[PDB]
Amino acid sequence: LVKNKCVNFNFNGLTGTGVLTESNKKFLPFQQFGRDIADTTDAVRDPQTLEILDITPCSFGGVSVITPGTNTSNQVAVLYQDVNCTEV
Amino acid sequence: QKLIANQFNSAIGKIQDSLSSTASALGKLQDVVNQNAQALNTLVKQLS
């Protein structure tokens, strides 16, 4: 098991791709999946050792090319929207 | 002037409580925000 690094995970038949992290949300013992308002999978419990893992989509955001007119320059500054600067 | 001063100030004060004591004054805004978050929920639930 790996943390804070986007993986493609299967937990006890539950499949999903996200960023598995430590999490403070506390399950009831019999429970399996945490969820969210969208019914989308949110938190999970590691079966081999019980621990509450969050999930998170990959990153996404749109690419945006900031440019002066091609009449001025051919240089552009790329904006990656709504991401943290690592995965670049 | 002095009178109009007080009427103004005492009018401003009640604007606080008009907002402070009732949450329905902002419904117009609150409705906009909800309907946006509304359709998004609906749009998401359509995935399932």
Partner: peptide, 25 residues
Amino acid sequence: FNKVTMAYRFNGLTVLPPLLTDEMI
């Protein structure tokens, strides 16, 4: 601001930031 108040970002619905921050408004 008290009265008014990745869920949709998981799929694709990305809530872009309004050009003008509230502090500017």
